[PDB]
Design an enzyme around this catalytic site. Structure first.
Site, PDB file in Angstrom:
ATOM      1  N   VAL A 163       0.803  -1.226   0.000  1.00  0.00           N
ATOM      2  CA  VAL A 163       0.000   0.000   0.000  1.00  0.00           C
ATOM      3  C   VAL A 163       0.842   1.286   0.000  1.00  0.00           C
ATOM      4  O   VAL A 163       0.355   2.333  -0.466  1.00  0.00           O
ATOM      5  CB  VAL A 163      -0.977   0.036   1.212  1.00  0.00           C
ATOM      6  N   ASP A 164       2.079   1.219   0.512  1.00  0.00           N
ATOM      7  CA  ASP A 164       2.931   2.414   0.657  1.00  0.00           C
ATOM      8  C   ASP A 164       3.653   2.731  -0.645  1.00  0.00           C
ATOM      9  O   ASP A 164       4.882   2.793  -0.729  1.00  0.00           O
ATOM     10  CB  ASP A 164       3.916   2.274   1.837  1.00  0.00           C
TER      11      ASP A 164
ATOM     12  N   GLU B 269       8.559 -12.714   1.919  1.00  0.00           N
ATOM     13  CA  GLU B 269       9.338 -12.553   0.683  1.00  0.00           C
ATOM     14  C   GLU B 269      10.348 -13.675   0.491  1.00  0.00           C
ATOM     15  O   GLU B 269      10.580 -14.117  -0.650  1.00  0.00           O
ATOM     16  CB  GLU B 269      10.025 -11.210   0.674  1.00  0.00           C
TER      17      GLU B 269
END
Length: 284
Positions: free
Chosen positions: A151-152, A242
């Site tokens: 979102v950032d 990740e």
């Protein structure tokens, strides 16, 4: 729909592809398993838009906005409206602990947004993979493809149907020029995310992956299960989900790879010549 009977393309007038003229000579545009690597200049978006519109393709975009990260939603969604799959059907899924803090963003026609409320750091680490693998039935019924992003971030240029494929990852902007030994894979054999120094194709980002709903659920389910095994064994991978995404995509090759155009940080890395466009970028 995916895989359904495909009607004929209409007549189109566009430049002829020339066999003895590469689109790009400065970069690898196909992986050794014959997956395209998506760079500006490699695709005719008019052809691709026709193909995907003729299938009435619906794209889901998932984003998690927890605690103070709700502040990033306005710019994220406003810029998605300008740049993400414009002309196609889009369903945003905003996962948040603060439904009332979701900004009222005006959407173009054929686009919708759903606010999905969500509830120990260990469960927080696994939340994204777990939630994508809770939402299983819904996504299968509502969208053809899922795109999963942080979102950032903000969209600055076109992100469209050129990315769509059964399974894709994105080349991490920090490591696209690195040799595999320098990749920050999980290196401890005790973790399910372990990758030896002599393995690895690319370093993919946790912040931009996707594919068909089926393939994305397979990925997120596998990563969630691997993360649970690690938790039981008292080990946390160096870069969390990740690291697991990287292990998964090593063993299940993506059918497209997105170039670093698709997730860049201009403050940290500038604007190299090899990037003709910066499409989706970290907010400073």
């Amino acid at each position: 729909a995916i895989g359904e009977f495909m009607v004929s393309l209409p007549r189109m007038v566009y430049p002829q592809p020339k066999v003895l003229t590469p689109c790009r000579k400065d970069v690898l545009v196909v992986t050794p398993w014959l997956a395209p690597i998506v760079w500006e200049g490699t695709f005719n978006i008019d052809i691709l838009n026709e193909q995907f519109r003729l299938q009435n393709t619906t794209i889901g975009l998932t984003v998690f906005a927890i605690k103070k990260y709700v502040a990033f939603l306005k710019l994220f969604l406003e810029t998605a409206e300008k740049h993400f799959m414009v002309g196609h059907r889009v369903h945003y899924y905003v996962f948040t602990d603060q439904p009332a803090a979701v900004p009222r963003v005006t959407l173009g026609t054929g686009r919708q947004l759903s606010v999905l409320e969500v509830r120990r750091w260990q469960d927080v680490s696994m939340r994204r993979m777990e939630m994508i693998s809770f939402c299983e039935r819904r996504f299968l019924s509502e969208v053809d493809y899922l795109v999963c992003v942080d979102v950032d971030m903000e969209f600055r240029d076109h992100v469209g149907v050129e990315i769509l494929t059964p399974l894709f990852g994105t080349l991490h902007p920090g490591f696209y020029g690195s040799s595999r030994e320098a990749f920050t894979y999980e290196r401890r054999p005790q973790s399910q995310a372990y990758i030896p120094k002599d393995e690895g194709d690319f370093y993919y980002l946790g912040g931009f992956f996707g594919g068909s709903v089926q393939e994305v659920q397979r990925l997120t389910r596998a990563c969630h299960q691997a993360m649970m095994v690690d938790q039981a064994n008292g080990i946390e991978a160096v870069w969390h989900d990740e690291s697991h995404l990287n292990k998964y995509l090593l063993r299940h090759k993506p059918t497209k790879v997105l170039s670093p155009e698709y997730l860049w940080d201009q403050q940290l890395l500038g604007w190299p010549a090899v990037l003709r466009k910066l499409r989706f970028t970290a907010v400073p």
